[PDB]
């Protein structure tokens, strides 16, 4: 003689996608700060299967960055009212500019780069200068699940993002994930423990990008070594335009990557490293922001090799950018007074593949969502279903 | 203190010892507008579960005894087969077909019929 009984709080969860809020220890401000000591709960005897390729978190993070970035150019000065000579990376261009008053004009001496120039922006889109007060310094961001949900973390040292996870834990909030806008080279990302691993949506298909995660970080310095100057020309009223790697450590890393490639292409086959074949400039180049000025550096000096079975790079600057293939919107970067120096860790690669025993690998590009996937592979969102009914042979008192 | 969802991989019998841990952590200008509807959804997600708990003669947390006899067709398993050799995730999978049948039987099952007779009984 057995009867139904209602249990509340039973550990039952299902895969789900929802809106996630933010946690931050100027874009990061207004984002609910993190708890001084988070709690991580291990799920004994639990095996959960992950699919990093079909994660909704990435595409919610990606859609968050795009739409939060345009807000960073809304209260900023619009650059709609915008003869050159010198090879010369920059060109001293002169032009007539409106003053405070509509009638009067002003001649100017400015310095733009060859890539920004009529400027290239007008052919495609309107343009807005960034607010010089806000900063683009990367700071760790935690993505959190609201009540009634939870986030599962795969506590595996070596994980390609798919299949069963024998040691699962759950947290309310992801770790401090760096939103670092880098291309080709992942900068300040998560470092894999022990052996390096490789991840691609489809290994058989060459067209699918191939994400590499370092275990040994690669120190990398880039520097804009010329002391520039800023004269704030008055394009009123009120608005104002601001006018102007170790080779010893890299082969150790690569030498681990061929061992990391392992049986995926075969032990016998040779592994060749070649520069990107071409495309958009954001793909061809290790593009990233450093000190507020956007760096574009040629990585052909790192990817020239042919590995049998048994270090400075050039750099150029663009004053304006249309990141995320966003057209209609363009940002001018107001330059910074002084010399710029950065020191970051290269934490991973994005790589593509070609269509015997010849394997060609190029630096990565395309969607920036892949780089978020270099952080969100350990995570997936689940919905908590706490109501349960079962028999226990107790009857209600009457 | 095994934590939130701690006994997930444990048997049903042992996981009902740690019920109060998943129940307390069940409620736990643009841009910020995306954290608001998460708070808002959190309470309608919580009141929905407790309205049932209310339409059902429970409300009282964690455990609740019923006057619905478990017809065999729902499981046909000795309670030892269920409490001592099965997890809640497995059990929720077996009964998935009959769950909404039970949910409907609960409310009608006693309270509609149970609260009414108490009204008769509490007259005298």
């Amino acid at each position: 003689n057995l009867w139904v009984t209602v249990y509340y709080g039973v550990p039952v969860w299902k895969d789900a996608e929802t809106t996630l809020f933010c946690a931050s220890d100027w874009a990061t401000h207004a984002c609910v700060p993190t708890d001084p000591n988070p709690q991580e709960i291990h799920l004994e005897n639990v095996t959960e299967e992950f699919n990093m390729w079909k994660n909704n978190m990435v595409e919610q993070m990606h859609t968050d960055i795009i739409s939060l970035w345009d807000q960073s150019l809304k209260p900023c000065v619009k650059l709609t009212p915008l003869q050159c000579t010198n090879r010369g990376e920059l060109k001293n261009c002169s032009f007539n500019m409106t003053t405070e008053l509509r009638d009067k004009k002003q001649k100017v001496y400015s310095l733009f780069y060859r890539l920004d120039v009529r400027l290239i922006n007008c052919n495609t889109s309107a343009i807005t200068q960034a607010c010089p007060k806000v900063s683009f310094e990367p700071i760790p961001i935690h993505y959190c699940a609201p009540a009634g949900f939870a986030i599962l973390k795969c506590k595996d040292k070596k994980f390609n993002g798919t299949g069963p996870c024998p040691s699962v834990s759950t947290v309310q909030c992801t770790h401090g994930i760096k939103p670092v806008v880098s291309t080709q080279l992942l900068l300040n990302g998560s470092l894999a423990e022990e052996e390096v691993m490789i991840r691609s949506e489809n290994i058989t298909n060459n067209a699918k990008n191939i994400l590499v995660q370092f275990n040994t970080p690669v120190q990398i310095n880039c520097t804009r070594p010329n002391n520039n100057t800023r004269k704030s020309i008055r394009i009123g009223p009120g608005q104002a335009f601001y006018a102007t790697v170790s080779k010893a450590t890299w082969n150790e890393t690569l030498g681990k990557v061929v061992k990391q490639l392992r049986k995926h292409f075969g032990n016998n086959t040779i592994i060749r490293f070649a520069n990107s074949s071409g495309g958009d400039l954001e793909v061809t180049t290790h593009s990233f922001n450093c000190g507020g000025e956007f760096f574009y550096c040629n990585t052909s000096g790192l990817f020239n090799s042919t590995w049998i079975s048994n270090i400075t790079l050039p750099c150029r600057i663009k004053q304006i950018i249309n990141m995320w293939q966003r057209i209609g919107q363009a940002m001018y970067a107001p330059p910074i007074q002084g010399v710029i120096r950065c020191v970051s860790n290269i934490t991973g690669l994005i790589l593509t593949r070609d269509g015997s025993t010849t394997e060609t690998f190029r630096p990565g590009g395309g969607d920036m969502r892949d780089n978020w996937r270099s952080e969100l592979y350990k995570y997936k969102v689940v919905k908590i279903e706490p109501l349960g009914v079962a028999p226990t042979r107790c009857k209600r008192r009457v | 203190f095994l934590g939130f969802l701690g006994a997930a991989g444990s048997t049903m019998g042992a996981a009902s010892m740690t019920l109060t841990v998943q129940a307390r952590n069940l409620l736990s200008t643009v841009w910020g507008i995306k954290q608001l509807q998460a708070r808002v959804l959190a309470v309608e997600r919580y009141l929905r579960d407790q309205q049932l708990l209310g339409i059902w003669g429970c409300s009282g947390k964690l455990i609740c005894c019923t006057n619905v006899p478990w017809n065999s067709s729902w499981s046909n398993r000795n309670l030892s087969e269920i409490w001592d050799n099965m997890t809640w995730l497995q059990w929720d999978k077996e009964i998935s077909n009959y769950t909404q049948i039970i949910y409907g039987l609960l409310e009608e099952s006693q309270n509609q019929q149970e609260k009414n007779e108490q009204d008769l009984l509490a007259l005298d």
Partner: antibody
Amino acid sequence: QIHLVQSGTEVKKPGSSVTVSCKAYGVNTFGLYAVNWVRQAPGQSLEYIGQIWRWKSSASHHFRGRVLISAVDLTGSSPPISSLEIKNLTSDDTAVYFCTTTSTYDRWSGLHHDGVMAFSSWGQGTLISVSA
Amino acid sequence: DIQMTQSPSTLSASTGDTVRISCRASQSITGNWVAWYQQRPGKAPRLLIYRGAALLGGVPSRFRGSAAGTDFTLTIGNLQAEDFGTFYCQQYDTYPGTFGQGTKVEVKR
């Protein structure tokens, strides 16, 4: 799309062994799909031989210990592949052998019940004839 | 092991007919862990129905199954030419999964 292609038809003599291959095209990984090997005797009903799920090999009690079922994940060269090896053939083993692929990513699918599952993808078939 | 006894062994019908194939198990399968398969001679079986009432993606609406206790029934209304063949019920409640004897569906003449 998922296409499962098996090895060619093979003729074998009693007491011999044999390994049948199965290329799983369209399958993303055997971490999110399980492989079940089923044989159908001539003009007969189907019979479960074994499976491999979560990289765990297993076989039915009738065929237990007599058969070895291995599989290897995806490579850049080739799609993931499973292999059904049967030792010490008898004439009662003359049957057609089928590859099975069923998605395992979702717990609630109802295709699978704690490793015991139905069969969502199938192959062309391998005729194993055992005769002296 | 579960023993699936299928019935009838052979049935005859015509296009547009509504036809019902029964399959009994030795034990009762509460979880409804039973699948149905169609196999035309020579080609590989197709998974039509899993878990009783669940249609697999791409299987026509006219295939519908019902599961109560030990008995199971596959129902094909508006019988079509493509539907003729042999049908098998398969349980997967207890290891190992077991199939039925099968049911042959021939044309009336």
